[PDB]
Design a protein around this ligand. Structure first.
Ligand code: LXW
Ligand code: CA
Length: 223
């Protein structure tokens, strides 16, 4: 997260860190057994880390649970990033508490202008590289479809939305991938892609979760 702020420990209790020897992506806990992340975060050997603030120190509220199965969306295209969503099944159910909590799925899509919370342990620099230990947060509005398409001509599908700031300076970045965009208490986006981080006229692009709720619900009913 570039240009954001320290969230505060466990104030984003649905935020998970995906670990394969090191943090590599975020995700969102949607019930005690399932995490939503980005398809471009797929790899084998995932451990889901819940209840995290400082990802380099055991602070006492963590739950570390291996994935038993990952399911990349059947229609994910790794070239256009259309359908950039993946479900991860935990080997055992998380114990839900004030520091480890699920985020609701949307029933309606969010609207342009709605202010959302984006969070993660990704790079905090727009040029250069610095990775934080504690969770970072950014308040960002959803942008109009027309401004999003003007920023990324030919590349925005109906399964994507832009959020952030056309002036730059505030954005998600590498390592935030797969994490949440929450608006009015619902998971409306997944950190997906952009042209650099926090660059002028290049806001972040997010997977539009409301288009995937039927697939999520049917998949978790059968796995
Ligand atoms: N900029 C790259 C990106 O978003 N990549 C690389 C893999 C991870 C993800 C990421 O950091 N997502 C998080 C993010 C990035 C930028 N703003 C907001 C959030 C993109 C690309 C996407 C997926 C696969 C390959 C490349 C890219 C686009 C054009 C030129 C080069 C790279
Ligand atoms: Ca920790």
């Amino acid at each position: 997260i570039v240009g954001g702020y320290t969230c505060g420990a466990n104030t984003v209790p649905y935020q998970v860190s995906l670990n394969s020897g090191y943090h590599f992506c975020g995700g969102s806990l949607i019930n005690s057994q399932w995490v939503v992340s980005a398809a471009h975060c797929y790899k084998s050997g995932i451990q889901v880390r819940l209840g995290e603030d400082n990802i380099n120190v055991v602070e006492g509220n963590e739950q570390f649970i291996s994935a038993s199965k990952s399911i990349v969306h059947p229609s994910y295209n790794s070239n256009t990033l259309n359908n950039d969503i993946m479900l991860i099944k935990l080997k055992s159910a998380a114990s839900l508490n004030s520091r480890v909590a699920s985020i609701s799925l949307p029933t309606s899509c969010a609207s342009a202008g709605t202010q959302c919370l984006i969070s993660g342990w990704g790079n905090t620099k727009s040029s250069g590289t610095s990775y934080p230990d504690v969770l970072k947060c950014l308040k960002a509005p959803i942008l109009s479809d027309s401004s999003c398409k003007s920023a990324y001509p030919g590349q925005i599908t109906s399964n994507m939305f832009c959020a952030g700031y056309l002036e730059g300076g505030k954005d998600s970045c590498q390592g935030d991938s797969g994490g949440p965009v929450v608006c009015s208490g619902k998971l409306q986006g997944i950190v997906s892609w952009g042209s650099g981080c926090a660059q002028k006229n290049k806001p972040g692009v997010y997977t539009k979760v409301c288009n995937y709720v039927s697939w999520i619900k049917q998949t978790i009913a059968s796995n």
